Amino acid sequence: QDVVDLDFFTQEPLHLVSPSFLSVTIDANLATDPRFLILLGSPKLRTLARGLSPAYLRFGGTKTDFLIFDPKKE
């Protein structure tokens, strides 16, 4: 047969996840793309990202430990 019966347990929740349960990253390496500022200004990208709100956006990756803030850089 290909009919499958389901059992549900709905009496009370097993867990509560965050409203931001499905969140996303941007890899730290993207900040080395010379186009970084232009790419992240895309209206279409902003529209897509708003679709996933509420969410965390984590900026990190392997390059996290190879990036240095330069407050004098243009």
Binding site: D2, V3, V4, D5, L6, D7, F8, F9, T10, P13, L14, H15, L16, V17, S20, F21, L22, S23, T25, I26, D27, A28, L30, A31, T32, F36, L37, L39, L40, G41, P43, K44, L45, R46, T47, L48, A49, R50, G51, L52, S53, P54, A55, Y56, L57, R58, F59, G60, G61, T62, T64, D65, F66, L67, I68, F69, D70, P71, K73, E74
Partner: protein
Amino acid sequence: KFKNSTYSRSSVDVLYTFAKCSGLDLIFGLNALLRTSDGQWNSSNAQLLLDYCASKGYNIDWELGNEPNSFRKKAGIFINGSQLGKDFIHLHKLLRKSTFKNAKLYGPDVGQPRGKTAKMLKSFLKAGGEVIDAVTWHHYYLNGRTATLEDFLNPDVLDTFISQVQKVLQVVESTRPGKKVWLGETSSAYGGGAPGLSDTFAAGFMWLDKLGLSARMGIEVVMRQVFFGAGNYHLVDENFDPLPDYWLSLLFKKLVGTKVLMASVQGQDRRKLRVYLHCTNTDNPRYKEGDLTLYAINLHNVTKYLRLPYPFSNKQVDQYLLRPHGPDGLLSKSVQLNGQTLKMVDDQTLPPLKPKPLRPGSSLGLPAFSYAFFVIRNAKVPACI
């Protein structure tokens, strides 16, 4: 070969503005490999950045370091968990001294359990667990260089995630019970993803199953590598085109609520038919308190029909069934919702995500190699109300 680079105030501004304008909460990873000659974290560069962000009014949360378990291999230096914990305590003091109100700190972003990594996590939590608001770890199923379509469809591969989660929770339970646990960076395959695989419809089985199991096992937040970038596991490519996993994630966001329930298959479980159950996302205007969202994966090569248990057996059900579109089959970069290809209406308009209402009392049909969300309307579940 040298990975070291600088970034500017403008890069920080751009990243913060992108998050703010999109309704996202930014978490910024600081560089843990700036070290004093005494083996401590040198906080001078982070201080400059914190001061700048505070001056600008940016509400940002912080991390320190990425996969410290691999520092010895990638950077030639070993930092043990106790020292990393001390470094987080130092960072926590800087955040409290700042004009940030309620800045959160997450760590330590270790790679998935392997004998020695579990020990580093444990020693980190002993020394630094008090100052982090959630424990972060990373997971990938496979090496992107060698992964095959069969691997992406294999219930045995999907199941390897369970043991990895169990190991991490056990470590946290033994040191900080009830500290929140987050997947801080995760996807199908490491090394930039599997080319022609991690960006296809077939990537969705790993993504949806991971969400299901994470919710059921007590992970509070799952951070998908990546929203946007050059890696093959991106949700959105650098032409700004969304991949099938983007639409899967969007439907998940709209339909799946915060209360995790339980669904299982009666009898023989081959693990190719995988089901998860939450209350419906109350933010969704179509639905009301008490509704349930079932989501299901069918890794069989034939259609399966799901029968809802009483009293849900005779409720109105809304179907959101995803299938690949076009001649690439499971490897398509195009996906259909209930027979309609998902595409942006224009650069600023997401398309409608229209349910297909099913005949009440009908069994839920799940074709071979597909996944779907089913909203059970008027389920009137008290736990959800």
